[model samples]
Target chain A: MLSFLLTLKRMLRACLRAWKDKEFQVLFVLTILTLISGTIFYSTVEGLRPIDALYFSVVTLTTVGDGNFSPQTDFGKIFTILYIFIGIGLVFGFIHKLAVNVQ
Target chain B: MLSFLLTLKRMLRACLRAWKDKEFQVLFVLTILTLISGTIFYSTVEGLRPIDALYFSVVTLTTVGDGNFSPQTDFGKIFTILYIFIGIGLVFGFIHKLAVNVQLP
Candidate 1:
């Protein structure tokens, strides 16, 4: 228990420190860019509101795919395939890099 | 877009091939183990049914935080923090490695 908390604290500090790495910075920015663009694009393509579009972007990138919402248009579907590939890649890259630093 | 579809197809092929990599295999196995263990743990701690437990596990691992449910107990909350740190790492590592392969020169 004490060790777990200590480990968790150490991991959190490591993650904060990793923010200085170039690889982490690039991936972080790329993720933010994708989220913004995806939200705007999904809002337009899917005729969803701003909040819903952002929500969809987060869910999709995370690969959670809660099934409560999804792209309905042919364009939306196609965009989703590409978005998942890139957005998820960037997000996972960022997390992986940070986690690796913890170890 | 025809070009977009072509790129997607190529990426898909690369991903399929990446399944052969040892790093991906370990990450995949780790993710599955965490999900199964988390589902059972959450269900026992939260008193949720099996299906809902799985759902919570998926959402938490993905960092989606769907807000449909969450850990109410102290043990559950502490477990959640550790789970998120490890689970997201494995999932992202898996996706990142697969994506890197698609772009390999």
Candidate 2:
């Protein structure tokens, strides 16, 4: 039991050190860029209100699209399909990279 | 070929070394606390069953409000406005700070 606790503490300490890396900085910037770009594009081309667009962006990024306001037009459909297909994978990859970096 | 492999290996080693830092432990604790407290307060005040409150808390914390469950009473609304208003920034800052802290030590 004591050994387990000691190991946990050591592992925690290691995580603390890893939080200072450049890889994480790059990923953080990428996250913000994706957030901004995705929102802007969705609102402009998809004709979604800004709030709805932002909502879609986050939901889409998080893989939790609740389908409250889905794309209706062909362009909207195409954009959304592309968004979901590409954005999900991209964000997932970034998150995966983050986990790998900190692991 | 070996040079590319070496570069990759070096990068991986740097990341591995970074995973040994302390800020992550603290940020992780903060994350757990935010999740706990936000969820508890929301459901209790809003008369939302615990699960709905948990759902609301997660949604609000992530700033993904779908308007599915919202504040009903004045205090509930006040609490929610305060909760979502500050909670979003707080969590965002925590996540931001976390990203800052984990920048390859």
In the range B28-79, model 1's lDDT, one tens digit per residue, is: 7668889999889988998989988888987778776646565666577557
Question: What DockQ do the predictions score, one after another?
Answer: 0.07, 0.06
Candidate 1 on A1-103: residue-level lDDT in tens? Answer: 5654564466456457657889878887887788789889989999987656765676677665534566889999999999999965776576566455433
lDDT of 1 at A47: 92
Report lDDT per candidate: 0.72, 0.62
Q: RMSD, each candidate, Å?
A: 11.5, 11.1
**TM-score for predicted model 2 compared with the true structure:** 0.48
Query: For model 2, how does the per-residue alpha-carbon lDDT over B3-27 read when each residue is reduced to its tens digit?
Result: 9999999999976675564544444
Q: Could you tell me how far off, in angstroms, the CA of residue B93 lies in candidate 2 after the best superposition? A: 17
